[PDB]
Amino acid sequence: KAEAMALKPDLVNVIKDVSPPPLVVMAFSMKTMQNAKNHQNEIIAMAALVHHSFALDKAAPKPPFQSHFCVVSKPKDCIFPYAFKEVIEKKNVKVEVAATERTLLGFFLAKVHKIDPD
Amino acid sequence: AQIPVDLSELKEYSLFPGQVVIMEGINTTGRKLVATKLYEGVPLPFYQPTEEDADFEQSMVLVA
């Protein structure tokens, strides 16, 4: 979000006796399925958990997360079960459904950029 | 380390135990290799004759 440049390394000094600021922490997991044809293992699902204020010098927060999101897709050949979206809205879950792997990757990258974890 | 080798996708090969070989293949999980290319071996250079060796005459050798 903010950028600056120093002409020479001389222009930089240090103070050490100030408390560190809180950080953003993301913990994510993913699912893979082996490509039947040849030599690939595709990504079919992801789930991440985010905390926007993680104290480095204090006790761990409880709960360790505030927000989360999830994504799912179909590899190349299978199709989602009939009325998948109906079931999704029926059970009130924050699951974003994607068509191909490329859309899933784009969504993941957009979320990573927007949240901007450390 | 030891890994299993899968030869389903290998067209031409000739293998015996103890052969030092160089393979090219896919190993995605790290517990099994699907071989796709087998590099051929290369022999040692022949003996280089001297000037004396070309002056020898015809000889007969028997082997039993």
Coordinates of N, CA and C in Angstrom, one line a residue:
Chain A
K1 N 0.8 -1.2 0.0 CA 0.0 0.0 0.0 C 0.8 1.3 0.0
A2 N 2.0 1.3 0.6 CA 2.8 2.5 0.7 C 4.3 2.1 0.3
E3 N 4.9 2.9 -0.5 CA 6.2 2.7 -1.0 C 7.1 4.0 -0.8
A4 N 8.4 3.7 -0.7 CA 9.4 4.8 -0.5 C 10.7 4.3 -0.9
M5 N 11.7 5.2 -1.2 CA 13.0 4.8 -1.6 C 14.0 5.7 -0.9
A6 N 15.1 5.1 -0.5 CA 16.3 5.8 0.1 C 17.4 5.8 -0.9
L7 N 18.1 6.9 -1.1 CA 19.1 7.0 -2.1 C 20.4 6.2 -1.7
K8 N 20.7 6.3 -0.4 CA 21.9 5.6 0.1 C 21.6 4.8 1.4
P9 N 22.3 3.7 1.6 CA 22.1 3.0 2.9 C 22.4 3.8 4.1
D10 N 23.2 4.8 4.0 CA 23.5 5.7 5.1 C 22.3 6.3 5.7
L11 N 21.2 6.6 4.9 CA 20.0 7.3 5.3 C 19.1 6.5 6.3
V12 N 19.5 5.3 6.7 CA 18.6 4.4 7.4 C 19.2 4.2 8.8
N13 N 18.4 4.4 9.9 CA 18.8 4.3 11.3 C 17.9 3.3 12.0
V14 N 18.2 3.0 13.2 CA 17.5 1.9 14.0 C 17.1 2.4 15.4
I15 N 15.9 2.1 15.8 CA 15.5 2.1 17.2 C 14.9 0.7 17.5
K16 N 15.3 0.2 18.7 CA 14.9 -1.2 19.0 C 14.0 -1.3 20.2
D17 N 13.8 -0.2 21.0 CA 13.0 -0.3 22.2 C 11.6 0.3 21.9
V18 N 10.9 -0.4 21.0 CA 9.5 -0.1 20.7 C 8.8 -1.4 20.5
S19 N 7.5 -1.6 21.0 CA 6.8 -2.8 20.9 C 6.4 -3.1 19.5
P20 N 6.4 -4.4 19.1 CA 6.1 -4.7 17.7 C 4.6 -4.6 17.4
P21 N 4.2 -4.3 16.2 CA 2.8 -4.2 15.8 C 2.1 -5.5 15.6
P22 N 0.8 -5.6 15.6 CA 0.1 -6.9 15.3 C 0.2 -7.2 13.8
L23 N 0.1 -8.5 13.5 CA 0.3 -9.0 12.1 C -1.0 -9.7 11.6
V24 N -1.0 -10.0 10.3 CA -2.1 -10.7 9.7 C -1.6 -12.1 9.4
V25 N -2.4 -13.1 9.8 CA -2.0 -14.5 9.7 C -3.0 -15.3 8.9
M26 N -2.6 -16.0 7.9 CA -3.5 -16.8 7.1 C -3.0 -18.3 7.2
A27 N -3.9 -19.2 7.5 CA -3.7 -20.6 7.5 C -4.6 -21.3 6.5
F28 N -4.0 -22.0 5.6 CA -4.8 -22.5 4.4 C -4.5 -24.0 4.2
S29 N -5.5 -24.7 3.7 CA -5.3 -26.1 3.3 C -5.9 -26.3 1.9
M30 N -5.5 -27.4 1.2 CA -5.9 -27.6 -0.1 C -6.0 -29.1 -0.4
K31 N -6.7 -29.5 -1.4 CA -7.0 -30.9 -1.8 C -6.5 -31.1 -3.3
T32 N -5.9 -32.2 -3.5 CA -5.4 -32.6 -4.9 C -6.0 -33.9 -5.3
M33 N -6.2 -34.1 -6.6 CA -6.5 -35.4 -7.2 C -5.6 -35.6 -8.3
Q34 N -5.1 -36.9 -8.4 CA -4.2 -37.3 -9.5 C -4.9 -37.4 -10.8
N35 N -4.2 -36.8 -11.8 CA -4.7 -36.9 -13.2 C -4.5 -38.3 -13.7
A36 N -5.6 -38.9 -14.2 CA -5.6 -40.3 -14.6 C -4.8 -40.4 -15.9
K37 N -4.8 -39.4 -16.8 CA -4.1 -39.5 -18.1 C -2.6 -39.6 -17.9
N38 N -2.0 -38.6 -17.4 CA -0.5 -38.6 -17.3 C 0.0 -37.4 -16.5
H39 N 0.8 -37.7 -15.5 CA 1.8 -36.7 -14.9 C 1.3 -35.5 -14.3
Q40 N 0.0 -35.4 -13.9 CA -0.5 -34.2 -13.2 C -1.2 -34.6 -11.9
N41 N -1.2 -33.6 -11.0 CA -2.0 -33.7 -9.8 C -2.7 -32.3 -9.7
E42 N -4.0 -32.3 -10.0 CA -4.8 -31.0 -10.0 C -5.3 -30.7 -8.7
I43 N -5.7 -29.4 -8.6 CA -6.2 -28.8 -7.3 C -7.7 -28.7 -7.5
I44 N -8.4 -29.2 -6.5 CA -9.9 -29.2 -6.6 C -10.6 -28.5 -5.5
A45 N -9.8 -28.2 -4.4 CA -10.5 -27.5 -3.3 C -9.4 -26.7 -2.4
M46 N -9.9 -25.6 -1.8 CA -9.0 -24.9 -0.9 C -9.9 -24.3 0.2
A47 N -9.2 -24.0 1.4 CA -9.9 -23.4 2.5 C -8.9 -22.6 3.3
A48 N -9.2 -21.4 3.7 CA -8.3 -20.5 4.4 C -9.0 -19.9 5.6
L49 N -8.2 -19.6 6.6 CA -8.6 -19.0 7.8 C -7.7 -17.8 8.1
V50 N -8.3 -16.6 8.4 CA -7.6 -15.4 8.5 C -7.8 -14.7 9.9
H51 N -6.7 -14.1 10.4 CA -6.7 -13.3 11.6 C -6.0 -12.0 11.3
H52 N -6.7 -10.9 11.4 CA -6.2 -9.6 11.1 C -5.4 -8.9 12.2
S53 N -5.4 -9.4 13.4 CA -4.6 -8.8 14.5 C -4.0 -9.9 15.3
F54 N -2.8 -10.3 15.0 CA -2.1 -11.3 15.7 C -1.0 -10.7 16.5
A55 N -1.0 -10.8 17.8 CA 0.0 -10.2 18.7 C 1.2 -11.1 18.8
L56 N 2.3 -10.6 18.4 CA 3.5 -11.4 18.4 C 4.1 -11.6 19.8
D57 N 3.9 -10.5 20.7 CA 4.5 -10.5 22.0 C 3.5 -10.8 23.1
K58 N 2.4 -11.3 22.8 CA 1.4 -11.6 23.8 C 0.9 -13.1 23.6
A59 N -0.2 -13.4 24.4 CA -0.7 -14.8 24.3 C -1.5 -14.9 23.0
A60 N -1.7 -16.2 22.5 CA -2.4 -16.4 21.3 C -3.9 -16.0 21.4
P61 N -4.4 -15.4 20.3 CA -5.8 -15.0 20.4 C -6.8 -16.2 20.5
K62 N -7.9 -16.0 21.1 CA -9.0 -17.0 21.2 C -10.3 -16.3 20.8
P63 N -10.9 -16.8 19.7 CA -10.5 -17.8 18.7 C -9.3 -17.4 17.8
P64 N -8.6 -18.3 17.3 CA -7.4 -17.9 16.4 C -7.8 -17.3 15.1
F65 N -9.1 -17.2 14.7 CA -9.4 -16.7 13.4 C -10.7 -15.9 13.5
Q66 N -10.9 -15.0 12.6 CA -12.1 -14.2 12.5 C -12.9 -14.4 11.2
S67 N -12.2 -14.4 10.1 CA -12.9 -14.7 8.8 C -12.3 -15.9 8.1
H68 N -13.0 -16.4 7.1 CA -12.6 -17.6 6.4 C -13.3 -17.7 5.1
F69 N -12.8 -18.5 4.2 CA -13.5 -18.7 2.9 C -13.1 -20.1 2.3
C70 N -13.9 -20.6 1.4 CA -13.7 -21.9 0.8 C -14.0 -21.9 -0.7
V71 N -13.4 -22.8 -1.4 CA -13.6 -22.8 -2.9 C -13.6 -24.3 -3.3
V72 N -14.2 -24.6 -4.4 CA -14.3 -26.0 -4.9 C -14.5 -25.9 -6.5
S73 N -14.0 -27.0 -7.1 CA -14.1 -27.0 -8.6 C -14.2 -28.5 -9.1
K74 N -14.3 -28.7 -10.4 CA -14.4 -30.0 -11.0 C -13.2 -30.1 -12.0
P75 N -12.5 -31.2 -12.0 CA -11.2 -31.3 -12.7 C -11.2 -31.0 -14.2
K76 N -11.8 -32.0 -15.0 CA -12.0 -31.8 -16.4 C -13.2 -32.5 -16.9
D77 N -13.6 -33.6 -16.2 CA -14.6 -34.5 -16.8 C -15.8 -34.7 -15.9
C78 N -15.7 -34.8 -14.6 CA -16.8 -34.9 -13.7 C -17.7 -33.7 -13.7
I79 N -18.9 -33.8 -13.2 CA -19.8 -32.7 -13.1 C -20.4 -32.6 -11.7
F80 N -20.7 -31.4 -11.2 CA -21.2 -31.3 -9.9 C -22.6 -32.0 -9.8
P81 N -22.9 -32.6 -8.6 CA -24.2 -33.2 -8.4 C -25.3 -32.2 -8.6
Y82 N -26.5 -32.8 -9.1 CA -27.6 -32.0 -9.4 C -28.1 -31.2 -8.2
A83 N -28.5 -30.0 -8.4 CA -28.9 -29.0 -7.4 C -27.8 -28.8 -6.3
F84 N -26.5 -28.7 -6.7 CA -25.4 -28.4 -5.8 C -25.6 -27.1 -5.1
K85 N -25.9 -26.0 -6.0 CA -26.1 -24.7 -5.5 C -27.3 -24.6 -4.6
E86 N -28.3 -25.4 -4.9 CA -29.5 -25.4 -4.0 C -29.2 -25.9 -2.6
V87 N -28.4 -26.9 -2.6 CA -27.9 -27.5 -1.3 C -27.0 -26.5 -0.6
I88 N -26.2 -25.8 -1.4 CA -25.3 -24.8 -0.8 C -26.0 -23.7 -0.1
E89 N -27.0 -23.1 -0.8 CA -27.8 -22.0 -0.2 C -28.7 -22.6 0.9
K90 N -29.1 -23.8 0.8 CA -30.0 -24.4 1.8 C -29.3 -24.5 3.2
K91 N -28.1 -24.9 3.2 CA -27.3 -25.1 4.5 C -26.6 -23.8 4.9
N92 N -26.7 -22.7 4.2 CA -26.1 -21.5 4.5 C -24.6 -21.6 4.8
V93 N -23.8 -21.9 3.8 CA -22.4 -22.1 4.0 C -21.7 -21.1 3.0
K94 N -20.6 -20.5 3.4 CA -19.9 -19.5 2.6 C -18.9 -20.3 1.7
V95 N -19.4 -21.0 0.7 CA -18.6 -21.8 -0.2 C -18.8 -21.1 -1.6
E96 N -17.7 -20.7 -2.2 CA -17.7 -20.2 -3.6 C -17.4 -21.3 -4.6
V97 N -18.3 -21.6 -5.5 CA -18.1 -22.7 -6.4 C -17.6 -22.1 -7.8
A98 N -16.6 -22.8 -8.3 CA -15.9 -22.4 -9.5 C -16.1 -23.5 -10.6
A99 N -15.9 -23.1 -11.8 CA -16.1 -24.0 -13.0 C -14.8 -24.8 -13.3
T100 N -13.7 -24.1 -13.5 CA -12.5 -24.8 -13.9 C -11.4 -24.5 -12.9
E101 N -10.2 -25.1 -13.1 CA -9.1 -24.8 -12.2 C -8.6 -23.4 -12.3
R102 N -8.6 -22.8 -13.5 CA -8.1 -21.5 -13.7 C -8.9 -20.5 -12.9
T103 N -10.2 -20.6 -12.9 CA -11.1 -19.7 -12.1 C -10.8 -19.8 -10.6
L104 N -10.6 -21.0 -10.2 CA -10.2 -21.3 -8.7 C -8.9 -20.6 -8.4
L105 N -7.9 -20.7 -9.2 CA -6.6 -20.1 -9.0 C -6.8 -18.6 -9.0
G106 N -7.5 -18.0 -9.9 CA -7.7 -16.6 -10.0 C -8.4 -16.1 -8.7
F107 N -9.4 -16.8 -8.2 CA -10.1 -16.4 -7.0 C -9.2 -16.4 -5.8
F108 N -8.4 -17.5 -5.7 CA -7.5 -17.6 -4.6 C -6.4 -16.5 -4.6
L109 N -5.9 -16.2 -5.8 CA -4.9 -15.1 -5.9 C -5.5 -13.7 -5.6
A110 N -6.8 -13.5 -6.0 CA -7.5 -12.3 -5.7 C -7.7 -12.1 -4.2
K111 N -8.1 -13.2 -3.5 CA -8.2 -13.2 -2.1 C -6.9 -12.9 -1.3
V112 N -5.8 -13.6 -1.8 CA -4.5 -13.4 -1.2 C -4.1 -12.0 -1.3
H113 N -4.3 -11.4 -2.5 CA -3.9 -10.0 -2.7 C -4.7 -9.1 -1.8
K114 N -6.0 -9.2 -1.8 CA -6.9 -8.3 -1.0 C -6.6 -8.4 0.5
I115 N -6.5 -9.7 1.0 CA -6.3 -9.8 2.5 C -4.9 -9.3 2.8
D116 N -3.9 -9.6 2.0 CA -2.5 -9.2 2.1 C -1.9 -9.7 3.4
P117 N -1.8 -11.0 3.6 CA -1.2 -11.6 4.8 C 0.3 -11.4 4.9
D118 N 0.8 -11.4 6.1 CA 2.2 -11.3 6.4 C 2.8 -12.7 6.7
Chain B
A1 N 19.1 -44.4 -1.6 CA 17.6 -44.6 -1.5 C 17.2 -45.5 -2.6
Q2 N 16.0 -46.2 -2.4 CA 15.4 -47.1 -3.4 C 14.0 -46.7 -3.7
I3 N 13.7 -46.7 -5.0 CA 12.3 -46.4 -5.4 C 11.8 -47.5 -6.4
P4 N 10.5 -47.8 -6.4 CA 10.0 -48.7 -7.5 C 10.0 -47.9 -8.9
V5 N 10.1 -48.7 -10.0 CA 10.1 -48.1 -11.3 C 9.0 -48.8 -12.1
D6 N 8.2 -47.9 -12.7 CA 7.0 -48.4 -13.5 C 7.4 -48.3 -15.0
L7 N 7.4 -49.4 -15.7 CA 7.8 -49.4 -17.1 C 6.7 -49.6 -18.1
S8 N 5.5 -49.2 -17.8 CA 4.3 -49.3 -18.7 C 4.5 -48.4 -19.9
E9 N 5.0 -47.2 -19.6 CA 5.1 -46.1 -20.7 C 6.4 -46.1 -21.3
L10 N 7.2 -47.1 -21.2 CA 8.6 -47.2 -21.8 C 8.5 -48.1 -23.0
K11 N 8.9 -47.6 -24.2 CA 8.7 -48.3 -25.4 C 9.7 -49.4 -25.6
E12 N 11.0 -49.0 -25.6 CA 12.1 -50.0 -25.8 C 13.1 -49.9 -24.6
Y13 N 13.4 -51.0 -24.1 CA 14.4 -51.1 -23.0 C 15.0 -52.4 -22.9
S14 N 16.1 -52.5 -22.1 CA 16.8 -53.8 -21.9 C 17.5 -53.6 -20.5
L15 N 17.1 -54.4 -19.5 CA 17.5 -54.2 -18.2 C 18.0 -55.5 -17.5
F16 N 19.0 -55.4 -16.7 CA 19.5 -56.6 -15.9 C 19.9 -56.0 -14.6
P17 N 19.9 -56.8 -13.5 CA 20.3 -56.3 -12.2 C 21.7 -55.9 -12.1
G18 N 22.0 -54.8 -11.4 CA 23.3 -54.3 -11.3 C 23.8 -53.3 -12.4
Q19 N 22.9 -53.0 -13.3 CA 23.2 -52.1 -14.4 C 23.2 -50.6 -14.0
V20 N 24.3 -49.9 -14.1 CA 24.3 -48.5 -13.8 C 23.6 -47.7 -15.0
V21 N 22.5 -47.1 -14.7 CA 21.6 -46.5 -15.7 C 21.2 -45.1 -15.4
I22 N 20.9 -44.3 -16.4 CA 20.3 -43.0 -16.2 C 18.9 -43.0 -16.9
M23 N 17.9 -42.7 -16.1 CA 16.5 -42.7 -16.5 C 16.0 -41.2 -16.5
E24 N 15.0 -41.0 -17.4 CA 14.2 -39.8 -17.4 C 12.8 -40.1 -17.3
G25 N 12.1 -39.5 -16.3 CA 10.7 -39.8 -16.0 C 10.0 -38.8 -15.2
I26 N 8.8 -39.2 -14.7 CA 8.0 -38.4 -13.9 C 7.9 -39.0 -12.5
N27 N 8.1 -38.2 -11.4 CA 8.0 -38.7 -10.1 C 7.3 -37.6 -9.3
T28 N 6.0 -37.6 -9.2 CA 5.2 -36.6 -8.6 C 5.0 -36.8 -7.1
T29 N 4.8 -38.0 -6.6 CA 4.7 -38.3 -5.2 C 6.0 -38.5 -4.5
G30 N 7.0 -38.9 -5.2 CA 8.3 -39.2 -4.6 C 8.5 -40.6 -4.1
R31 N 7.5 -41.5 -4.4 CA 7.6 -42.9 -4.0 C 7.5 -43.9 -5.1
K32 N 7.4 -43.4 -6.3 CA 7.4 -44.2 -7.5 C 7.7 -43.4 -8.8
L33 N 8.5 -44.0 -9.6 CA 9.0 -43.3 -10.9 C 8.3 -44.0 -12.1
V34 N 7.7 -43.2 -12.9 CA 7.2 -43.7 -14.2 C 8.2 -43.3 -15.3
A35 N 9.0 -44.3 -15.7 CA 10.1 -44.1 -16.6 C 9.5 -43.8 -18.0
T36 N 10.1 -42.8 -18.7 CA 9.7 -42.5 -20.0 C 10.9 -42.5 -21.0
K37 N 12.1 -42.3 -20.6 CA 13.3 -42.4 -21.5 C 14.4 -43.1 -20.8
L38 N 15.1 -44.0 -21.5 CA 16.2 -44.7 -21.1 C 17.4 -44.4 -22.0
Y39 N 18.4 -43.6 -21.4 CA 19.6 -43.2 -22.2 C 20.4 -44.5 -22.5
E40 N 20.9 -44.5 -23.7 CA 21.7 -45.6 -24.2 C 23.2 -45.5 -23.6
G41 N 23.8 -46.6 -23.4 CA 25.2 -46.6 -22.9 C 26.2 -46.2 -23.9
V42 N 27.4 -45.8 -23.4 CA 28.4 -45.4 -24.3 C 29.7 -46.2 -24.0
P43 N 30.3 -46.8 -25.0 CA 31.5 -47.6 -24.8 C 32.8 -46.8 -24.7
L44 N 33.9 -47.5 -24.3 CA 35.3 -46.9 -24.2 C 35.9 -46.8 -25.5
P45 N 36.8 -45.8 -25.7 CA 37.5 -45.7 -27.0 C 38.4 -46.9 -27.2
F46 N 38.6 -47.2 -28.5 CA 39.4 -48.4 -28.9 C 40.9 -48.1 -28.6
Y47 N 41.7 -49.1 -28.8 CA 43.2 -49.0 -28.6 C 43.7 -48.2 -29.8
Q48 N 44.7 -47.3 -29.5 CA 45.3 -46.5 -30.6 C 46.6 -47.1 -31.0
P49 N 46.6 -47.6 -32.3 CA 47.8 -48.3 -32.7 C 49.0 -47.4 -32.9
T50 N 50.2 -47.9 -32.6 CA 51.4 -47.2 -32.9 C 52.0 -47.4 -34.3
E51 N 53.1 -46.9 -34.6 CA 53.7 -47.1 -35.9 C 54.3 -48.6 -36.0
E52 N 54.8 -49.1 -34.9 CA 55.3 -50.5 -34.9 C 54.2 -51.5 -35.2
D53 N 53.0 -51.3 -34.6 CA 51.9 -52.2 -34.7 C 51.4 -52.5 -36.1
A54 N 51.6 -51.5 -37.0 CA 51.2 -51.6 -38.4 C 52.3 -52.4 -39.3
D55 N 53.4 -52.7 -38.7 CA 54.5 -53.4 -39.4 C 54.5 -54.9 -39.2
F56 N 53.5 -55.4 -38.3 CA 53.4 -56.8 -38.1 C 52.8 -57.6 -39.2
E57 N 53.2 -58.8 -39.3 CA 52.7 -59.7 -40.4 C 51.5 -60.6 -40.0
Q58 N 51.0 -61.3 -40.9 CA 49.8 -62.2 -40.7 C 50.1 -63.3 -39.7
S59 N 49.2 -63.5 -38.8 CA 49.4 -64.5 -37.7 C 48.1 -65.3 -37.6
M60 N 48.2 -66.5 -37.1 CA 47.1 -67.4 -36.9 C 47.0 -67.8 -35.4
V61 N 45.8 -67.7 -34.8 CA 45.6 -68.0 -33.4 C 44.5 -69.1 -33.3
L62 N 44.8 -70.0 -32.3 CA 43.9 -71.1 -32.0 C 43.3 -70.9 -30.6
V63 N 42.0 -71.2 -30.4 CA 41.4 -71.0 -29.2 C 40.6 -72.2 -28.8
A64 N 40.8 -72.8 -27.6 CA 40.0 -73.9 -27.1 C 39.7 -73.7 -25.6

